[PDB]
């Protein structure tokens, strides 16, 4: 089974988030919840549902009907950013987690991705190798999905996608490359690279008859 | 409390055996009232669930559907650990191991090990291939250009890129490298310029890798 997560929700201090985890008939078995900081092991913040384990602060509290597992905070602290999980059981496997969630706690106001899309440089295709090179800047909060497209159909086969990373003015930076032949770049018409950032797609295309 | 203490190498070749130890302490690894397993988090993604042991009436254990041709998950009843071991190794299989304890009834993790990363690469040391990132056609109307550099398939970090031997900083965005499934580095790094000079400006990037003696300048070719 899949538990579907958002990929971020982000949250000003002191305000509700609310973090979902949908899958068919999830509401049918219990559900755990997860907290995940950079560099240590995952915490337990809730369990059955909506039971708060020992330690676990009130504002954390959970839900489950359905279809929809809800994770809610009440109050966000900033100390609550993290990566928040889900999990349940199916059958016959007796584990499955959540995509994951990366929750925020606005420090700075939302920012847009700056995207710009790189075509292979003639000296690569002298080389006989091809690479896309799209750079993904100045967006906050330091979440992105980025998905890449041959004409209109997506393409996952050699895309390496990095980690967001901080910058000096506190946002966050990315950086997507794709792999190809140059068979492969003269073959398809179009390529494009689309950055998704909270619902806003930011998309930027190239095209092997530019040069 | 209870301890679970990780062991096992942080690298190995691919297409090999990859073998982690959790070797407890405060609990017995054929406890009725818990559950012992392992879960993955390949770095900048999610949890996933590979595998779990218990001892009921007998040992009884479940693994994940990808590495269940591949997972065993043995109790040493002995030394007190229970051990994970992955045949036949690939890159996507680098990632952080954690061991974990399942709490009955809900068989909720209340016990993680400190977790090892683990590398499934070959790399060698190599000098990048240093290309130039430049837009075809143009034709802008903002008072602003980006150009870079592309450092691809280097090992191993770091790589320091510079422009105009140090005279141009501002506007300079060296992006951190990624970790491709070779086990190879690349990088980018970009500047932003006004476009009103693109015509007599030049721009050229400082490319330097220590570890394989590399120290290439190249410049950044502007198209019109």
């Known amino acids: 089974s899949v538990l579907t997560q958002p990929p971020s929700v982000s949250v000003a201090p002191g305000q509700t988030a609310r973090i979902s985890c949908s899958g068919d008939?999830?509401?049918?078995?219990?559900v755990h919840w997860y907290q995940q900081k950079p560099g240590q092991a995952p915490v337990l913040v809730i369990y059955?549902?909506?039971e708060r384990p020992s330690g676990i602060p009130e504002r954390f509290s959970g839900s489950n009907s359905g279809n929809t597992a809800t994770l809610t905070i009440s109050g966000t602290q900033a100390e609550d950013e993290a990566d928040y999980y889900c999990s349940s059981y199916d059958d016959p496997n007796f584990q499955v987690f959540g995509g994951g969630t990366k929750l925020t706690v606005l420090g700075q106001p939302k920012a847009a991705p700056s995207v710009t899309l790189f075509p292979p440089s003639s000296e690569e295709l002298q080389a006989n190798k091809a690479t896309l090179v799209c750079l993904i800047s100045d967006f906050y909060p330091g979440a992105v999905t980025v998905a890449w497209k041959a004409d209109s159909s997506p393409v996952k086969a050699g895309v390496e996608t990095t980690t967001p990373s901080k910058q000096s003015n506190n946002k966050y930076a990315a950086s997507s490359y794709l792999s190809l032949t140059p068979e492969q770049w003269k073959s398809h018409r179009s390529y494009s690279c689309q950055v998704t950032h909270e619902g806003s797609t930011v998309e930027k295309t190239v095209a092997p008859t530019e040069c | 409390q209870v301890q679970l203490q990780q062991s096992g190498p942080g690298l190995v070749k691919p297409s090999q055996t990859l073998s982690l130890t959790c070797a407890i302490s405060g609990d017995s690894v054929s406890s009725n009232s818990a559950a012992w397993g392992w879960i993955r988090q390949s770095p900048g993604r999610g949890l996933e669930w590979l595998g779990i042991?218990?001892?009921?009436?007998?040992?009884?254990?479940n693994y994940a559907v990808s590495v269940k041709s591949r997972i065993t998950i043995n109790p040493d009843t002995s030394k007190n650990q229970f051990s994970l071991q992955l045949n036949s190794v690939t890159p996507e299989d680098t990632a952080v191991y954690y061991c974990?304890?399942?709490?009955?009834?809900?068989?909720?993790?209340?016990?993680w090990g400190q977790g090892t990363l683990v590398t499934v690469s070959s790399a060698s040391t190599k000098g990048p291939s240093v290309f130039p990132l430049a837009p075809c056609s143009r034709s802008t109307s903002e008072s602003t250009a980006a150009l870079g550099c592309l450092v691809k398939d280097y090992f191993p970090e770091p790589v320091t890129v510079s422009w105009n031997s140090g005279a141009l900083t501002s506007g300079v965005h060296t992006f951190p490298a990624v970790l491709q499934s070779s086990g190879l580095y690349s990088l980018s790094s970009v500047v932003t310029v006004p476009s009103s000079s693109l015509g007599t400006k030049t721009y050229t990037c400082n490319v330097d890798h220590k570890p394989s003696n590399t120290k290439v300048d190249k410049r950044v070719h502007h198209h019109h």
């Open positions: 974990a304890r399942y709490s009955y009834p809900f068989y909720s993790i209340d016990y």
């Open positions: 059955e549902d909506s």
């Open positions: 042991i218990q001892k009921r009436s007998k040992w009884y254990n």
């Open positions: 008939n999830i509401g049918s078995y219990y």
